[PDB]
């Protein structure tokens, strides 16, 4: 009974049967939700503007090295000059 | 982030499941990022030096 930043929210959704409905209490973060108009009743901020699709749980969001290599009949020139101020004529090319 | 969360899976429709936050166990704390204070003062100094000329 006394920062806040998060909400112990609830709602009712669809269950395995479209005939039946189910209530579940979850939690959400601030700014993910903004007020509508006692007992606070809230709303997902995205439903006001665009759709929503949950990301897959087994998808790795860690960035790994991705080389960009040239096709056949082309070549990527890299500059080897250390002090390449702006963009000009790089003398040391590979 | 110091929050110790829990996967609460709730079946929506036939197979899909909505993974939400349960009750946070073991205290609640704010997320933070540390930066080496001594190491940052040297980097802001090297930048202002080469911006100078």
């Amino acid at each position, epitope marked *: *009974i*006394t920062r806040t930043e998060l909400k112990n929210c609830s709602f009712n959704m669809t269950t395995e049967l479209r005939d039946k409905k189910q209530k579940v209490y979850s939690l959400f973060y601030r700014l993910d939700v903004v007020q509508i108009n006692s007992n606070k009743e809230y709303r997902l901020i995205n439903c006001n503007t665009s759709a929503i699709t949950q990301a897959c749980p087994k998808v790795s969001f860690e960035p790994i090295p991705i080389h960009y290599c040239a096709p056949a009949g082309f070549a990527i020139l890299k500059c080897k000059d250390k002090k390449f101020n702006g963009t000009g004529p790089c003398p040391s090319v590979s | 982030r*110091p929050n110790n969360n829990t996967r609460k899976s709730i079946r929506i429709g036939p197979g899909q499941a909505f993974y939400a936050t349960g009750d946070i166990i073991g*205290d609640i*704390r*704010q997320a*933070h990022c540390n930066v080496s204070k001594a190491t940052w003062n040297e980097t802001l100094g090297k930048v202002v030096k080469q911006l100078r000329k």
Partner: antibody
Amino acid sequence: VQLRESGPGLVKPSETLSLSCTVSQDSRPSDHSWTWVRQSPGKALEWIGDIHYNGATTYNPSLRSRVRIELDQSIPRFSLKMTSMTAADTGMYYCARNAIRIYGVVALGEWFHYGMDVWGQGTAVTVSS
Amino acid sequence: ELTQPPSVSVSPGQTARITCSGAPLTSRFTYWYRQKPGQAPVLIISRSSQRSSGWSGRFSASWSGTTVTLTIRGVQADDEADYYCQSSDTSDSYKMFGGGTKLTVLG
């Protein structure tokens, strides 16, 4: 753990009074914030301000002009001061520790107050010429 | 300007009820302590987590809108002294003091 007062415990109304307290055999004295309290002869407890090895200055707003607390970073000496106001309020002044535990990261607002958990031997102070 | 009563009593071996009313009762929590005459007060109840602190059997606490509830153990015998009450302002600066109730046991 141990903590006992110091000083004379008596003064005339015109001259500033200054007393101290000594903590020892404490596992960690630096982080814990401490404050002093007084008990009027009418058995009405009162609050004077907190202070920290951090160097934080705070007192009761009704006694701001009188009190000015000092600190000793080397060995914990808990000096206290009271200048303009002296008479009537005279009674049993105490020595205490306002224990502090942490629920995470300092300077982030994660240092909840445990409250007063150890006190001093107890001393009495009255004004009478 | 918090308010703690100073004169209530109850029978020994019965549950009692200690209150302390004040508007700055949010970021303040509650102190009380029982100072036996001529002695030093001790921890009435102590915060060892941000959730709650009524684990020990002897005492428990409840929270209302402004008044705070200091419930106590079933037996009220042998332990008697005046119970003060202390808290801190919203700016986390200042500690209010406002008296406390001396309790006497019948029989």
